[PDB]
Amino acid sequence: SNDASFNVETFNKTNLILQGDATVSSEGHLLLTNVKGNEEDSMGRAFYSAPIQINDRTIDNLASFSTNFTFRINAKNIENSAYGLAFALVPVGSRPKLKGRYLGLFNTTNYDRDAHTVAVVFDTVSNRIEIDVNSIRPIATESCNFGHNNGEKAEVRITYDSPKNDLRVSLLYPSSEEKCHVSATVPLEKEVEDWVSVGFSATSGSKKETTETHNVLSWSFSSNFI
């Protein structure tokens, strides 16, 4: 097996795979979508350059992982923004999919086993944290008012306890002290490939008034077999 961790105190494009409109600012923040110019239908993705082993066939053992990151979404109109930001596990070498509500991660509305993608979505359209497993129809959600915290930093903690197939998400907006959480049972070994690229993806609104930016400020990840 292979364990791996990284702690991104400030982003640098050198160790990332940037796709779409994703860029790293001079301040070292990950800008997933356009922050200037045409933000309509802007889409970007970014993954750590090294693949992460999730399933080691030889030991019939699965890895557990933990990832913490902070982000900030800044919308034009806090009551009509879209679409959201997502943390995702995707196939190594994969290219962006559909924009809009597909978040650049999916290309069909219904379940598609061949997608091999799991994502934790911070949906600004519905104001919910959603766990999407190979489809945009969430297997679990919980309301989380992102709009009330427009332009504020959110601290997120995601853990995957493999023995229990337990994926847990906790979010906190220190400014308002709003907390959001959601968990779901997801057998990763069946839903994603043996190795995956971990990262983020985001899509901005299709019209002038529904645009918003999606920036990740810091990010640490750790996976290990046990």
Ligand X SMILES: *[C@@H]1O[C@H](CO)[C@@H](O[C@@H]2O[C@H](CO)[C@@H](O)[C@H](O)[C@H]2NC(C)=O)[C@H](O)[C@H]1NC(C)=O
Q: To the nearest whole angstrom, how small is the minimum distance from the Cβ of residue 223 to ligand NAG?
A: 9
CB nearer ligand NAG, residue 72 or residue 168: 168
State the residue for tokens 């601290």.
155
Residue from 2, 3, 5, 28 touching ligand X (CB under 6 A): that is: 28
Q: To the nearest whole angstrom, how small is the minimum distance from the Cβ of residue 61 to its own copies?
A: 11
- Contact yes or no for 121/214 (Cβ under 8 A): no
Euclidean distance between CA atoms 72 and 154, whole angstroms: 6
Query: Which one of its own copies, ligand X, ligand NAG, none is in contact with 57 (Cβ closer than 5 to 8 A by kind)?
Result: ligand X
Stretch 24-63 residues interacting with its own copies (CB under 8 A): 28, 48-53, 56, 58
Beta strands in 57-117 (DSSP E): 61-75, 83-91
3 binds its own copies (CB under 8 A): yes
Residue from 9, 36, 37, 58 touching ligand X (CB under 6 A): that is: 58
Q: To the nearest whole angstrom, how small is the minimum distance from the Cβ of residue 62 to ligand X?
A: 12
Euclidean distance between CA atoms 191 and 89, whole angstroms: 10
Bridge-based pairing of strands 118-123 and 83-91 is antiparallel
- Contact yes or no for 33/21 (Cβ under 8 A): yes
How many other C-beta atoms lie within 10 A of the C-beta of residue 29? 18
Contact characters 158-197, its own copies, x per CB under 8 A:
-------------------------------------x--
